[PDB]
Structure 1
Amino acid sequence: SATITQDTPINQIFTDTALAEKMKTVLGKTNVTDTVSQTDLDQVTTLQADRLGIKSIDGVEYLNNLTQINFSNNQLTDITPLKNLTKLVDILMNNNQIADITPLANLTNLTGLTLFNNQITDIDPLKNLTNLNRLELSSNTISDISALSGLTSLQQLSFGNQVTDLKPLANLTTLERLDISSNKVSDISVLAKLTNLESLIATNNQISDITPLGILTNLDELSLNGNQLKDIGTLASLTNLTDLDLANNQISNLAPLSGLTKLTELKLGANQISNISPLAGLTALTNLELNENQLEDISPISNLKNLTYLTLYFNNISDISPVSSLTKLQRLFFYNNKVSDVSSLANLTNINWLSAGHNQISDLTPLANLTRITQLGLNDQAWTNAPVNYKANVSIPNTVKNVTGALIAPATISDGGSYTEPDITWNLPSYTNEVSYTFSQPVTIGKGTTTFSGTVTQPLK
């Protein structure tokens, strides 16, 4: 029956036990076998039933006056009980396993519909929901967005993950925030028509041509990470950008960014950058990511005195001293570089995460007073000493120093060699071109703990 005709136990109406328990509370009852009438059911206008392990919403069709529901983070598959709930204005049902959204098709009073991370492919049922202003369909398996073409009140939209053809967006000029992350898009030409866009998230697509963005001057947040960008000249137009993510592309020429002085967050990791001089004027930056590039000279960063978070890992940097002037720096990552001298880092007392593994660091004494550290990385240093002559009996000084200034004794020594402060000594009865040793010393500075370890190579001439 489409109505409750006699006072009926809650657990006969709501057959999912988790929903029945929720409804007991909502309906002001004390046991799921308590009876309710249609009138009692009609009092319910909102339902926040997220995270409850609900697998079925059978029974919800009797809650005729629902206007807002949240069933996010459940196990919903079948949503047919919503079909006739036409007073619904907002639905939150992200993080379920819904595939068939035909039951939404006549819910034309919907203004908000959140369905991200379900199993939806066919969005044709959304075609007539023309009052929508928020529609979230990211992390689904949609390939065809034709059904969106009439949704001309949309302000916020996302969808995924199989879309190639964006042409159905052409008339959606109200759009302000668009998230097309994780699709199969190369052609973003339609986006030039969406001149009200303030946020465009397009991570992990196949985009190489960003000229469509040139007239999108309202953009303040742009994520194009994980694409195929190289020429970013278009971005020079986008002077309202404050949050720009360009990581995992093929970019080398940063000159188009030089005038983007509102930027506060700039992500440029995993590109082909060797020259950051165009960044020198971006003095509002608080977060800058430059990992996995080809950097050696980082002197331009010294200008960026609002930085609190900086990544430089996986470069070819030997001179880290430009960061020494960044007083607000809280987290600094430069593992996998060629830094030997960390004397300049003694300045940085606001530092709480200092990650410097896989460098050429031999002496921790400059770090000794960095007592606000809570996370620390110093594993797997390596350096090669200047050569000395092969001799049958060769000695070199141990140079490895802990934070206290004490020498750290070798952990292993090659070629049968041995320690006694201060040298490492080898007897080499055969001709030999190299010897080496390692060290491995746990250390804590402030509250941050790591192993300071490394391999020292000594060429023999």
Structure 2
Amino acid sequence: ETITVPTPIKQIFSDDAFAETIKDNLKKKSVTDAVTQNELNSIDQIIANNSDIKSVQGIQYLPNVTKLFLNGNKLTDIKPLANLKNLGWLFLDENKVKDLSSLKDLKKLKSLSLEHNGISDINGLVHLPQLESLYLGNNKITDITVLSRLTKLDTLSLEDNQISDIVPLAGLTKLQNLYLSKNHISDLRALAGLKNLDVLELFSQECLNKPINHQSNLVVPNTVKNTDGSLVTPEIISDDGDYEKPNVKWHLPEFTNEVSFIFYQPVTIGKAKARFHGRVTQPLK
């Protein structure tokens, strides 16, 4: 893809903010200055975080860009990135990107960061099996099915999301750094085969059960399971409850909003030592 003649920067890059970025990058003196495709070929790096950018329309004509640092902007549509075949590092933290469908020819992309975009659907990752690093913290991700296809990742961050099923990760045995803290994980069984782990984080899990009826002798089953499949005994129980394996029981003579319990168990997988820690809360009606 190539511009048909020397064209003013203003007319290639429709976003005022991104046009200025290119102008400064090319060391031109005005957004009306015409640029040749040769000058657009010479750009290999765009560092433009917190620059008020709403659109990267025009970037299609930058074949050779290898790095894109675009954190803290306002990008919603990444379609113009589709055909940047030489891009290796892409940072889009704190943007509004909610769709990765259009990343289906970034076959040299090794590092992707999409933290804090409010993303839930990550299925477009199926097009990037060569990824070595993927940062997805602070998003609204429930379904990590597609990550099973990302078998070359060594670093994967999924912290502070809405995940409870981590079975999709069982075949990612090249993983060395896995961040899973602040999710809804109560079952560690499927992480048992990740024997190359050096760093694992598993703290502050929160599990909010579906409501049950209040009653004097309240019984709630424990379903917190270790990697070996055995139940994790609660550490602390609210409202003077106690543990009658496999259930947690309370005497509640008066009505209460909610009951809960904390679990905390040290864990080892391969060379990585972690703390499987969290809270299960049971609303009453």
Give TM-score, length-normalised by structure 2. Answer: 0.86
What is the distance in 1 between the residues matched to 2:34 and 2:93? Answer: 23
The size of the alignment, in residue pairs, is 262
Question: Is it true that 1:230 corresponds to 2:64 in the alignment?
Answer: no
Match of 1:279, SS state, is coil
Bigger mean CA deviation after superposition, 372-381 or 408-417? 408-417
Question: Is it true that 1:218 corresponds to 2:218 in the alignment?
Answer: no
Q: Name 1:245's counterpart in structure 2.
A: 69
TM-aligned CA distance change 1:189 to 1:317, over 3 Å: closer
* Candidates 59, 68, 80, aligned match of 1:256: 80
Q: Name 1:325's counterpart in structure 2.
A: 149
Q: Name 2:138's counterpart in structure 1.
A: 314
Identity %: 39
Question: Is it true that 1:300 corresponds to 2:160 in the alignment?
Answer: no
* Candidates 189, 198, 206, aligned match of 1:374: 198
C-alpha displacement of 1:336: 0.3
C-alpha displacement of 1:304: 0.5
Q: Name 1:338's counterpart in structure 2.
A: 162
Q: Name 2:8's counterpart in structure 1.
A: none
TM-aligned CA distance change 1:250 to 1:188, over 3 Å: closer
C-alpha displacement of 1:324: 1.0
C-alpha displacement of 1:234: 2.4
Indicate the structure (1 or 2) with the bigger Cα radius of gyration: 1
After superposition, the CA RMSD in angstroms is: 2.1
Check whether the contact 1:270–1:292 (CA below 8 A) recurs between aligned residues: yes
Match of 1:276, SS state, is coil
C-alpha displacement of 1:276: 1.5
TM-aligned CA distance change 1:214 to 1:415, over 3 Å: farther
C-alpha displacement of 1:225: 2.0
Question: Is it true that 1:394 corresponds to 2:218 in the alignment?
Answer: yes
For structure 2, the 5+ residue unaligned runs are 1-18
Check whether the contact 1:345–1:367 (CA below 8 A) recurs between aligned residues: yes
User: Deviations for 1:25-79, whole angstroms, at most 9, x for unmatched residues?
Assistant: xxxxxxxxxxxxxxxxxxxxxxxxxxxxxxxxxxxxxxxxxxxxxxxxxxxxxxx
TM-aligned CA distance change 1:283 to 1:212, over 3 Å: farther
Q: Name 2:102's counterpart in structure 1.
A: 278
Bigger mean CA deviation after superposition, 399-408 or 232-241? 232-241
TM-aligned CA distance change 1:237 to 1:451, over 3 Å: same
Give TM-score, length-normalised by structure 1. Answer: 0.54
What is the distance in 1 between the residues matched to 2:174 and 2:228? Answer: 21
Q: Name 2:173's counterpart in structure 1.
A: 349
What is the distance in 1 between the residues matched to 2:219 and 2:209? Answer: 13
What is the distance in 2 between the residues matched to 1:435 and 1:292? Answer: 31
* Candidates 358, 363, 367, aligned match of 2:187: 363
Check whether the contact 2:189–2:229 (CA below 8 A) recurs between aligned residues: yes
Match of 1:347, SS state, is coil
